Amino acid sequence: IVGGYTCGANTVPYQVSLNSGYHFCGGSLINSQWVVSAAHCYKSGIQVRLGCDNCQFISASKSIVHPSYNSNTLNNDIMLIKLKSAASLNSRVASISLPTSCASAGTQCLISGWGNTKSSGTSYPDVLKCLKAPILSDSSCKSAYPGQITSNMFCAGYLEGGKDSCQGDAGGPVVCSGKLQGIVSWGSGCAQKNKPGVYTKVCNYVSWIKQTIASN
């Protein structure tokens, strides 16, 4: 996260880290046995780390990539991880829910992760970083990224640059009024002018998520 702030411990309880000998992606705990993340974060035998600001280690029993995921365009960039054992959440603030409807343009959301904090150079933080950002209109998103924005993507952030998610944040949450509306996916560099973050549009997948959970 570039241009964001230190979240604080126990402030984003649904944020997880995906680990393969190192932190490589984020994810969102949506119930005690399932994590939502990006399809381009798929690896076999992922270890999920939960409740760790800088603490639970739970292996994936399986990681299910969307059947229409396109690794070239990152269309349908969503994955469901089933945990081998149930996660034990700590603080009893309300947790996140799947959306019942899509979020409208202009909606304010919270984006979080342990990714790069610099626009140029390399600086991975030890503690979780947070960013508040609005969802941008579909037309502005398509103008920023001609030919690359599908109905399964939305842009969020700031056109003037300076505030964005970044490498190391993929798979992580975009939460708007308690609903998981986005997944950190891609962008052109980080926090660059007229290049906002691009996010998987979770509301388009709620039927698939519910069916995947039911059948596995």
mmCIF file of all heavy atoms in Angstrom, residues 142-195:
data_model
loop_
_atom_site.group_PDB
_atom_site.id
_atom_site.type_symbol
_atom_site.label_atom_id
_atom_site.label_comp_id
_atom_site.label_asym_id
_atom_site.label_seq_id
_atom_site.Cartn_x
_atom_site.Cartn_y
_atom_site.Cartn_z
ATOM 1 N N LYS A 142 -12.121 2.723 -17.820
ATOM 2 C CA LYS A 142 -11.828 2.343 -19.196
ATOM 3 C C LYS A 142 -10.929 3.362 -19.897
ATOM 4 O O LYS A 142 -10.067 2.978 -20.689
ATOM 5 C CB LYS A 142 -13.133 2.159 -19.963
ATOM 6 C CG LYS A 142 -13.901 0.943 -19.483
ATOM 7 C CD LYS A 142 -15.241 0.829 -20.162
ATOM 8 C CE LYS A 142 -15.976 -0.428 -19.741
ATOM 9 N NZ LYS A 142 -15.266 -1.660 -20.148
ATOM 10 N N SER A 143 -11.107 4.649 -19.600
ATOM 11 C CA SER A 143 -10.239 5.676 -20.163
ATOM 12 C C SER A 143 -8.807 5.535 -19.665
ATOM 13 O O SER A 143 -7.855 5.752 -20.418
ATOM 14 C CB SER A 143 -10.770 7.071 -19.835
ATOM 15 O OG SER A 143 -12.004 7.299 -20.482
ATOM 16 N N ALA A 144 -8.641 5.172 -18.394
ATOM 17 C CA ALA A 144 -7.314 4.998 -17.841
ATOM 18 C C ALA A 144 -6.621 3.773 -18.443
ATOM 19 O O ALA A 144 -5.405 3.767 -18.638
ATOM 20 C CB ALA A 144 -7.384 4.877 -16.315
ATOM 21 N N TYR A 145 -7.406 2.737 -18.739
ATOM 22 C CA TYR A 145 -6.863 1.482 -19.255
ATOM 23 C C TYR A 145 -7.628 0.993 -20.488
ATOM 24 O O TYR A 145 -8.347 0.004 -20.418
ATOM 25 C CB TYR A 145 -6.906 0.393 -18.179
ATOM 26 C CG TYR A 145 -6.070 0.668 -16.948
ATOM 27 C CD1 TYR A 145 -6.659 1.130 -15.774
ATOM 28 C CD2 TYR A 145 -4.703 0.429 -16.947
ATOM 29 C CE1 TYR A 145 -5.893 1.366 -14.639
ATOM 30 C CE2 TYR A 145 -3.929 0.667 -15.816
ATOM 31 C CZ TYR A 145 -4.538 1.126 -14.668
ATOM 32 O OH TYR A 145 -3.763 1.353 -13.553
ATOM 33 N N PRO A 146 -7.472 1.685 -21.632
ATOM 34 C CA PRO A 146 -8.267 1.331 -22.815
ATOM 35 C C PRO A 146 -8.095 -0.126 -23.232
ATOM 36 O O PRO A 146 -6.970 -0.623 -23.271
ATOM 37 C CB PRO A 146 -7.728 2.278 -23.897
ATOM 38 C CG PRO A 146 -7.150 3.427 -23.139
ATOM 39 C CD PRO A 146 -6.604 2.851 -21.864
ATOM 40 N N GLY A 147 -9.211 -0.788 -23.518
ATOM 41 C CA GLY A 147 -9.203 -2.166 -23.969
ATOM 42 C C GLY A 147 -8.918 -3.230 -22.920
ATOM 43 O O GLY A 147 -8.908 -4.408 -23.259
ATOM 44 N N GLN A 148 -8.699 -2.836 -21.662
ATOM 45 C CA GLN A 148 -8.287 -3.793 -20.635
ATOM 46 C C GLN A 148 -9.271 -4.010 -19.494
ATOM 47 O O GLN A 148 -9.056 -4.903 -18.678
ATOM 48 C CB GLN A 148 -6.969 -3.356 -20.025
ATOM 49 C CG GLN A 148 -5.794 -3.424 -20.964
ATOM 50 C CD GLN A 148 -4.523 -3.082 -20.256
ATOM 51 O OE1 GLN A 148 -4.279 -1.921 -19.945
ATOM 52 N NE2 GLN A 148 -3.708 -4.096 -19.966
ATOM 53 N N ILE A 149 -10.310 -3.186 -19.403
ATOM 54 C CA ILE A 149 -11.245 -3.272 -18.279
ATOM 55 C C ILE A 149 -12.496 -4.045 -18.666
ATOM 56 O O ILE A 149 -13.232 -3.645 -19.576
ATOM 57 C CB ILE A 149 -11.659 -1.870 -17.780
ATOM 58 C CG1 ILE A 149 -10.423 -1.050 -17.393
ATOM 59 C CG2 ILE A 149 -12.672 -1.974 -16.633
ATOM 60 C CD1 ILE A 149 -9.576 -1.682 -16.289
ATOM 61 N N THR A 150 -12.752 -5.150 -17.978
ATOM 62 C CA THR A 150 -13.925 -5.956 -18.250
ATOM 63 C C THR A 150 -15.035 -5.648 -17.258
ATOM 64 O O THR A 150 -14.822 -4.918 -16.283
ATOM 65 C CB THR A 150 -13.605 -7.457 -18.180
ATOM 66 O OG1 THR A 150 -13.412 -7.825 -16.803
ATOM 67 C CG2 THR A 150 -12.349 -7.775 -18.961
ATOM 68 N N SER A 151 -16.202 -6.245 -17.473
ATOM 69 C CA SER A 151 -17.315 -6.098 -16.546
ATOM 70 C C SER A 151 -17.027 -6.705 -15.166
ATOM 71 O O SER A 151 -17.793 -6.504 -14.224
ATOM 72 C CB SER A 151 -18.581 -6.736 -17.127
ATOM 73 O OG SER A 151 -18.371 -8.107 -17.404
ATOM 74 N N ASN A 152 -15.920 -7.432 -15.053
ATOM 75 C CA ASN A 152 -15.541 -8.074 -13.790
ATOM 76 C C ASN A 152 -14.462 -7.325 -13.036
ATOM 77 O O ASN A 152 -13.849 -7.874 -12.118
ATOM 78 C CB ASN A 152 -15.051 -9.489 -14.042
ATOM 79 C CG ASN A 152 -16.087 -10.344 -14.706
ATOM 80 O OD1 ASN A 152 -17.201 -10.476 -14.208
ATOM 81 N ND2 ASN A 152 -15.733 -10.925 -15.845
ATOM 82 N N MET A 153 -14.213 -6.092 -13.450
ATOM 83 C CA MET A 153 -13.194 -5.240 -12.848
ATOM 84 C C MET A 153 -13.787 -3.900 -12.485
ATOM 85 O O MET A 153 -14.719 -3.437 -13.146
ATOM 86 C CB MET A 153 -12.033 -5.027 -13.811
ATOM 87 C CG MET A 153 -11.343 -6.305 -14.223
ATOM 88 S SD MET A 153 -10.209 -5.953 -15.572
ATOM 89 C CE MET A 153 -9.725 -7.609 -16.080
ATOM 90 N N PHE A 154 -13.232 -3.272 -11.460
ATOM 91 C CA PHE A 154 -13.470 -1.857 -11.223
ATOM 92 C C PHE A 154 -12.184 -1.187 -10.803
ATOM 93 O O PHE A 154 -11.253 -1.830 -10.307
ATOM 94 C CB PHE A 154 -14.582 -1.626 -10.182
ATOM 95 C CG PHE A 154 -14.239 -2.069 -8.778
ATOM 96 C CD1 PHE A 154 -13.642 -1.202 -7.874
ATOM 97 C CD2 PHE A 154 -14.540 -3.351 -8.360
ATOM 98 C CE1 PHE A 154 -13.353 -1.614 -6.568
ATOM 99 C CE2 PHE A 154 -14.256 -3.763 -7.063
ATOM 100 C CZ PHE A 154 -13.670 -2.897 -6.171
ATOM 101 N N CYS A 155 -12.131 0.117 -11.029
ATOM 102 C CA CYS A 155 -11.020 0.940 -10.593
ATOM 103 C C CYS A 155 -11.362 1.599 -9.274
ATOM 104 O O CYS A 155 -12.516 1.950 -9.039
ATOM 105 C CB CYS A 155 -10.685 2.029 -11.616
ATOM 106 S SG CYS A 155 -9.877 1.482 -13.137
ATOM 107 N N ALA A 156 -10.351 1.788 -8.438
ATOM 108 C CA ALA A 156 -10.522 2.555 -7.204
ATOM 109 C C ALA A 156 -9.238 3.271 -6.883
ATOM 110 O O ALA A 156 -8.145 2.786 -7.195
ATOM 111 C CB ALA A 156 -10.942 1.655 -6.050
ATOM 112 N N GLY A 157 -9.362 4.433 -6.257
ATOM 113 C CA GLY A 157 -8.184 5.197 -5.913
ATOM 114 C C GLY A 157 -8.297 6.647 -6.318
ATOM 115 O O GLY A 157 -9.369 7.228 -6.252
ATOM 116 N N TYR A 158 -7.164 7.209 -6.724
ATOM 117 C CA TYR A 158 -7.017 8.646 -6.919
ATOM 118 C C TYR A 158 -6.232 8.931 -8.185
ATOM 119 O O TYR A 158 -5.080 8.509 -8.309
ATOM 120 C CB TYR A 158 -6.311 9.269 -5.713
ATOM 121 C CG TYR A 158 -7.033 9.017 -4.412
ATOM 122 C CD1 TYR A 158 -6.775 7.877 -3.656
ATOM 123 C CD2 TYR A 158 -7.996 9.908 -3.954
ATOM 124 C CE1 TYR A 158 -7.451 7.643 -2.472
ATOM 125 C CE2 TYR A 158 -8.672 9.678 -2.772
ATOM 126 C CZ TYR A 158 -8.402 8.546 -2.043
ATOM 127 O OH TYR A 158 -9.081 8.333 -0.863
ATOM 128 N N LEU A 159 -6.858 9.650 -9.110
ATOM 129 C CA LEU A 159 -6.275 9.908 -10.425
ATOM 130 C C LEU A 159 -5.015 10.775 -10.380
ATOM 131 O O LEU A 159 -4.193 10.730 -11.297
ATOM 132 C CB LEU A 159 -7.316 10.553 -11.336
ATOM 133 C CG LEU A 159 -8.502 9.640 -11.655
ATOM 134 C CD1 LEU A 159 -9.485 10.322 -12.585
ATOM 135 C CD2 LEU A 159 -8.016 8.327 -12.249
ATOM 136 N N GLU A 160 -4.851 11.546 -9.312
ATOM 137 C CA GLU A 160 -3.679 12.404 -9.189
ATOM 138 C C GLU A 160 -2.441 11.631 -8.735
ATOM 139 O O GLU A 160 -1.334 12.171 -8.735
ATOM 140 C CB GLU A 160 -3.963 13.565 -8.228
ATOM 141 C CG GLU A 160 -4.262 13.152 -6.798
ATOM 142 C CD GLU A 160 -5.752 13.014 -6.504
ATOM 143 O OE1 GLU A 160 -6.500 12.496 -7.363
ATOM 144 O OE2 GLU A 160 -6.173 13.425 -5.399
ATOM 145 N N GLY A 161 -2.623 10.369 -8.360
ATOM 146 C CA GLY A 161 -1.510 9.536 -7.931
ATOM 147 C C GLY A 161 -1.182 9.696 -6.455
ATOM 148 O O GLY A 161 -1.781 10.526 -5.772
ATOM 149 N N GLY A 162 -0.244 8.893 -5.959
ATOM 150 C CA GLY A 162 0.178 8.992 -4.571
ATOM 151 C C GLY A 162 -0.431 7.997 -3.592
ATOM 152 O O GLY A 162 0.158 7.706 -2.558
ATOM 153 N N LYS A 163 -1.614 7.479 -3.909
ATOM 154 C CA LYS A 163 -2.334 6.574 -3.006
ATOM 155 C C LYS A 163 -2.891 5.379 -3.777
ATOM 156 O O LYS A 163 -3.748 5.547 -4.632
ATOM 157 C CB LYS A 163 -3.468 7.316 -2.294
ATOM 158 C CG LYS A 163 -2.999 8.293 -1.219
ATOM 159 C CD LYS A 163 -4.176 8.958 -0.515
ATOM 160 C CE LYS A 163 -4.784 10.061 -1.360
ATOM 161 N NZ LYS A 163 -5.868 10.795 -0.631
ATOM 162 N N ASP A 164 -2.416 4.175 -3.464
ATOM 163 C CA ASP A 164 -2.760 3.002 -4.265
ATOM 164 C C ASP A 164 -2.358 1.744 -3.531
ATOM 165 O O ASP A 164 -1.564 1.802 -2.589
ATOM 166 C CB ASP A 164 -2.041 3.089 -5.620
ATOM 167 C CG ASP A 164 -2.630 2.184 -6.708
ATOM 168 O OD1 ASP A 164 -3.671 1.511 -6.516
ATOM 169 O OD2 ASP A 164 -2.012 2.178 -7.802
ATOM 170 N N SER A 165 -2.911 0.609 -3.942
ATOM 171 C CA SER A 165 -2.342 -0.674 -3.558
ATOM 172 C C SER A 165 -1.126 -0.930 -4.472
ATOM 173 O O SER A 165 -0.871 -0.156 -5.398
ATOM 174 C CB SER A 165 -3.396 -1.795 -3.629
ATOM 175 O OG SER A 165 -4.016 -1.865 -4.895
ATOM 176 N N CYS A 166 -0.353 -1.981 -4.208
ATOM 177 C CA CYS A 166 0.908 -2.171 -4.931
ATOM 178 C C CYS A 166 1.340 -3.637 -4.860
ATOM 179 O O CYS A 166 0.611 -4.468 -4.325
ATOM 180 C CB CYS A 166 1.988 -1.241 -4.353
ATOM 181 S SG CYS A 166 3.429 -0.936 -5.409
ATOM 182 N N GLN A 167 2.500 -3.967 -5.431
ATOM 183 C CA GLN A 167 2.998 -5.338 -5.383
ATOM 184 C C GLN A 167 3.086 -5.836 -3.944
ATOM 185 O O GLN A 167 3.593 -5.139 -3.061
ATOM 186 C CB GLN A 167 4.368 -5.446 -6.070
ATOM 187 C CG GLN A 167 4.275 -5.606 -7.594
ATOM 188 C CD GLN A 167 3.670 -4.394 -8.284
ATOM 189 O OE1 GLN A 167 2.754 -4.511 -9.112
ATOM 190 N NE2 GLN A 167 4.178 -3.224 -7.946
ATOM 191 N N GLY A 168 2.573 -7.040 -3.723
ATOM 192 C CA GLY A 168 2.474 -7.605 -2.392
ATOM 193 C C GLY A 168 1.079 -7.481 -1.799
ATOM 194 O O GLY A 168 0.769 -8.127 -0.800
ATOM 195 N N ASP A 169 0.237 -6.651 -2.418
ATOM 196 C CA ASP A 169 -1.130 -6.458 -1.948
ATOM 197 C C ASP A 169 -2.147 -7.339 -2.667
ATOM 198 O O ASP A 169 -3.270 -7.474 -2.181
ATOM 199 C CB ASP A 169 -1.542 -4.996 -2.105
ATOM 200 C CG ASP A 169 -0.814 -4.083 -1.157
ATOM 201 O OD1 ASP A 169 -0.591 -4.501 -0.004
ATOM 202 O OD2 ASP A 169 -0.483 -2.955 -1.574
ATOM 203 N N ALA A 170 -1.790 -7.912 -3.822
ATOM 204 C CA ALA A 170 -2.765 -8.713 -4.581
ATOM 205 C C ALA A 170 -3.435 -9.788 -3.759
ATOM 206 O O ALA A 170 -2.819 -10.412 -2.897
ATOM 207 C CB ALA A 170 -2.136 -9.372 -5.799
ATOM 208 N N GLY A 171 -4.712 -10.012 -4.030
ATOM 209 C CA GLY A 171 -5.487 -10.993 -3.306
ATOM 210 C C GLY A 171 -6.205 -10.406 -2.100
ATOM 211 O O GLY A 171 -7.160 -10.994 -1.608
ATOM 212 N N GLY A 172 -5.735 -9.241 -1.658
ATOM 213 C CA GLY A 172 -6.256 -8.590 -0.469
ATOM 214 C C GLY A 172 -7.614 -7.942 -0.652
ATOM 215 O O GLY A 172 -8.138 -7.853 -1.768
ATOM 216 N N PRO A 173 -8.188 -7.461 0.458
ATOM 217 C CA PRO A 173 -9.570 -6.971 0.497
ATOM 218 C C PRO A 173 -9.753 -5.532 0.054
ATOM 219 O O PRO A 173 -8.920 -4.661 0.307
ATOM 220 C CB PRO A 173 -9.933 -7.087 1.977
ATOM 221 C CG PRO A 173 -8.634 -6.914 2.688
ATOM 222 C CD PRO A 173 -7.606 -7.601 1.807
ATOM 223 N N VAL A 174 -10.882 -5.307 -0.609
ATOM 224 C CA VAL A 174 -11.489 -3.990 -0.745
ATOM 225 C C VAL A 174 -12.851 -4.096 -0.076
ATOM 226 O O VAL A 174 -13.748 -4.759 -0.586
ATOM 227 C CB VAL A 174 -11.642 -3.545 -2.212
ATOM 228 C CG1 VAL A 174 -12.243 -2.165 -2.295
ATOM 229 C CG2 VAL A 174 -10.299 -3.592 -2.905
ATOM 230 N N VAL A 175 -12.982 -3.457 1.091
ATOM 231 C CA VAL A 175 -14.188 -3.599 1.903
ATOM 232 C C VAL A 175 -14.908 -2.262 2.001
ATOM 233 O O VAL A 175 -14.305 -1.243 2.314
ATOM 234 C CB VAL A 175 -13.839 -4.153 3.300
ATOM 235 C CG1 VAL A 175 -15.046 -4.156 4.222
ATOM 236 C CG2 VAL A 175 -13.315 -5.561 3.153
ATOM 237 N N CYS A 176 -16.193 -2.283 1.684
ATOM 238 C CA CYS A 176 -16.992 -1.068 1.606
ATOM 239 C C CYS A 176 -18.204 -1.266 2.488
ATOM 240 O O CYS A 176 -19.023 -2.137 2.208
ATOM 241 C CB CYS A 176 -17.419 -0.776 0.166
ATOM 242 S SG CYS A 176 -16.149 -1.118 -1.091
ATOM 243 N N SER A 177 -18.280 -0.486 3.565
ATOM 244 C CA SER A 177 -19.359 -0.591 4.548
ATOM 245 C C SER A 177 -19.605 -2.041 4.962
ATOM 246 O O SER A 177 -20.737 -2.527 4.973
ATOM 247 C CB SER A 177 -20.639 0.041 4.002
ATOM 248 O OG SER A 177 -20.477 1.449 3.918
ATOM 249 N N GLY A 178 -18.521 -2.740 5.275
ATOM 250 C CA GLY A 178 -18.618 -4.097 5.782
ATOM 251 C C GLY A 178 -18.744 -5.202 4.748
ATOM 252 O O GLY A 178 -18.808 -6.374 5.111
ATOM 253 N N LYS A 179 -18.783 -4.842 3.465
ATOM 254 C CA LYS A 179 -18.921 -5.822 2.397
ATOM 255 C C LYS A 179 -17.644 -5.967 1.581
ATOM 256 O O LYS A 179 -17.014 -4.980 1.201
ATOM 257 C CB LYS A 179 -20.067 -5.443 1.459
ATOM 258 C CG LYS A 179 -21.420 -5.238 2.146
ATOM 259 C CD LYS A 179 -21.891 -6.529 2.793
ATOM 260 C CE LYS A 179 -23.347 -6.445 3.232
ATOM 261 N NZ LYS A 179 -23.925 -7.802 3.439
ATOM 262 N N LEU A 180 -17.276 -7.211 1.309
ATOM 263 C CA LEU A 180 -16.126 -7.487 0.461
ATOM 264 C C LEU A 180 -16.499 -7.265 -0.999
ATOM 265 O O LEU A 180 -17.049 -8.158 -1.639
ATOM 266 C CB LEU A 180 -15.646 -8.919 0.681
ATOM 267 C CG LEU A 180 -14.400 -9.300 -0.120
ATOM 268 C CD1 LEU A 180 -13.208 -8.506 0.337
ATOM 269 C CD2 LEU A 180 -14.126 -10.798 -0.011
ATOM 270 N N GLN A 181 -16.206 -6.074 -1.518
ATOM 271 C CA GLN A 181 -16.594 -5.720 -2.885
ATOM 272 C C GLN A 181 -15.456 -5.906 -3.881
ATOM 273 O O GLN A 181 -15.703 -6.017 -5.089
ATOM 274 C CB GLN A 181 -17.093 -4.271 -2.956
ATOM 275 C CG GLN A 181 -18.393 -3.989 -2.189
ATOM 276 C CD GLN A 181 -19.635 -4.504 -2.884
ATOM 277 O OE1 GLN A 181 -19.572 -5.230 -3.872
ATOM 278 N NE2 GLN A 181 -20.792 -4.136 -2.345
ATOM 279 N N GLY A 182 -14.214 -5.938 -3.408
ATOM 280 C CA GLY A 182 -13.104 -6.074 -4.332
ATOM 281 C C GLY A 182 -11.960 -6.930 -3.851
ATOM 282 O O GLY A 182 -11.812 -7.182 -2.659
ATOM 283 N N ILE A 183 -11.137 -7.332 -4.811
ATOM 284 C CA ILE A 183 -9.904 -8.067 -4.568
ATOM 285 C C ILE A 183 -8.796 -7.320 -5.278
ATOM 286 O O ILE A 183 -8.928 -7.018 -6.465
ATOM 287 C CB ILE A 183 -9.972 -9.513 -5.105
ATOM 288 C CG1 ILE A 183 -11.157 -10.274 -4.510
ATOM 289 C CG2 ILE A 183 -8.673 -10.252 -4.800
ATOM 290 C CD1 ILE A 183 -11.519 -11.544 -5.263
ATOM 291 N N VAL A 184 -7.732 -6.984 -4.562
ATOM 292 C CA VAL A 184 -6.581 -6.335 -5.188
ATOM 293 C C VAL A 184 -6.085 -7.205 -6.343
ATOM 294 O O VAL A 184 -5.818 -8.393 -6.156
ATOM 295 C CB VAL A 184 -5.430 -6.100 -4.187
ATOM 296 C CG1 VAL A 184 -4.252 -5.439 -4.878
ATOM 297 C CG2 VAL A 184 -5.901 -5.229 -3.015
ATOM 298 N N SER A 185 -5.980 -6.619 -7.535
ATOM 299 C CA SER A 185 -5.635 -7.415 -8.713
ATOM 300 C C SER A 185 -4.442 -6.861 -9.487
ATOM 301 O O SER A 185 -3.365 -7.470 -9.485
ATOM 302 C CB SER A 185 -6.845 -7.545 -9.633
ATOM 303 O OG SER A 185 -6.563 -8.429 -10.719
ATOM 304 N N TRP A 186 -4.597 -5.727 -10.157
ATOM 305 C CA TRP A 186 -3.494 -5.205 -10.962
ATOM 306 C C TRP A 186 -3.545 -3.700 -11.114
ATOM 307 O O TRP A 186 -4.430 -3.040 -10.578
ATOM 308 C CB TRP A 186 -3.465 -5.879 -12.347
ATOM 309 C CG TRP A 186 -4.684 -5.657 -13.216
ATOM 310 C CD1 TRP A 186 -5.871 -6.334 -13.159
ATOM 311 C CD2 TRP A 186 -4.821 -4.707 -14.283
ATOM 312 N NE1 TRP A 186 -6.745 -5.859 -14.117
ATOM 313 C CE2 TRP A 186 -6.120 -4.854 -14.819
ATOM 314 C CE3 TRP A 186 -3.969 -3.735 -14.831
ATOM 315 C CZ2 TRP A 186 -6.586 -4.082 -15.884
ATOM 316 C CZ3 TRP A 186 -4.434 -2.970 -15.891
ATOM 317 C CH2 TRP A 186 -5.730 -3.145 -16.398
ATOM 318 N N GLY A 187 -2.582 -3.161 -11.851
ATOM 319 C CA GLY A 187 -2.529 -1.751 -12.167
ATOM 320 C C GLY A 187 -1.270 -1.528 -12.977
ATOM 321 O O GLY A 187 -0.485 -2.451 -13.173
ATOM 322 N N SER A 188 -1.064 -0.302 -13.428
ATOM 323 C CA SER A 188 0.161 0.046 -14.137
ATOM 324 C C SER A 188 1.089 0.761 -13.175
ATOM 325 O O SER A 188 0.860 1.919 -12.827
ATOM 326 C CB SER A 188 -0.142 0.921 -15.349
ATOM 327 O OG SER A 188 1.062 1.370 -15.950
ATOM 328 N N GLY A 189 2.129 0.063 -12.729
ATOM 329 C CA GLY A 189 2.950 0.552 -11.641
ATOM 330 C C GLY A 189 2.087 0.705 -10.401
ATOM 331 O O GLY A 189 1.050 0.047 -10.277
ATOM 332 N N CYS A 190 2.503 1.579 -9.492
ATOM 333 C CA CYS A 190 1.731 1.854 -8.280
ATOM 334 C C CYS A 190 1.633 3.339 -8.039
ATOM 335 O O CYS A 190 2.640 4.042 -8.113
ATOM 336 C CB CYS A 190 2.370 1.202 -7.057
ATOM 337 S SG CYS A 190 2.671 -0.523 -7.247
ATOM 338 N N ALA A 191 0.429 3.805 -7.721
ATOM 339 C CA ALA A 191 0.201 5.195 -7.338
ATOM 340 C C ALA A 191 0.645 6.192 -8.399
ATOM 341 O O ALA A 191 1.014 7.317 -8.070
ATOM 342 C CB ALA A 191 0.909 5.500 -6.009
ATOM 343 N N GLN A 192 0.602 5.781 -9.662
ATOM 344 C CA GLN A 192 0.943 6.683 -10.760
ATOM 345 C C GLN A 192 -0.256 7.513 -11.187
ATOM 346 O O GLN A 192 -1.400 7.091 -11.057
ATOM 347 C CB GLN A 192 1.484 5.894 -11.953
ATOM 348 C CG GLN A 192 2.770 5.145 -11.656
ATOM 349 C CD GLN A 192 3.834 6.039 -11.043
ATOM 350 O OE1 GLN A 192 4.090 7.150 -11.526
ATOM 351 N NE2 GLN A 192 4.454 5.565 -9.964
ATOM 352 N N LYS A 193 0.025 8.694 -11.721
ATOM 353 C CA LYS A 193 -0.996 9.595 -12.220
ATOM 354 C C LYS A 193 -1.842 8.905 -13.289
ATOM 355 O O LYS A 193 -1.299 8.274 -14.197
ATOM 356 C CB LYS A 193 -0.323 10.849 -12.781
ATOM 357 C CG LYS A 193 -1.223 12.025 -13.080
ATOM 358 C CD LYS A 193 -0.407 13.083 -13.822
ATOM 359 C CE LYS A 193 -0.987 14.475 -13.667
ATOM 360 N NZ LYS A 193 -2.451 14.464 -13.406
ATOM 361 N N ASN A 194 -3.164 9.005 -13.154
ATOM 362 C CA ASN A 194 -4.113 8.475 -14.138
ATOM 363 C C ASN A 194 -4.002 6.972 -14.374
ATOM 364 O O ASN A 194 -4.376 6.474 -15.435
ATOM 365 C CB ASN A 194 -3.957 9.216 -15.463
ATOM 366 C CG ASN A 194 -4.471 10.632 -15.380
ATOM 367 O OD1 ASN A 194 -5.575 10.866 -14.895
ATOM 368 N ND2 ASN A 194 -3.664 11.588 -15.826
ATOM 369 N N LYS A 195 -3.505 6.259 -13.368
ATOM 370 C CA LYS A 195 -3.402 4.807 -13.413
ATOM 371 C C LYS A 195 -3.857 4.242 -12.071
ATOM 372 O O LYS A 195 -3.035 3.801 -11.271
ATOM 373 C CB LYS A 195 -1.971 4.374 -13.731
ATOM 374 C CG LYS A 195 -1.513 4.700 -15.157
ATOM 375 C CD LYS A 195 -2.286 3.887 -16.180
ATOM 376 C CE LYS A 195 -1.819 4.199 -17.598
ATOM 377 N NZ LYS A 195 -2.598 3.435 -18.607
#
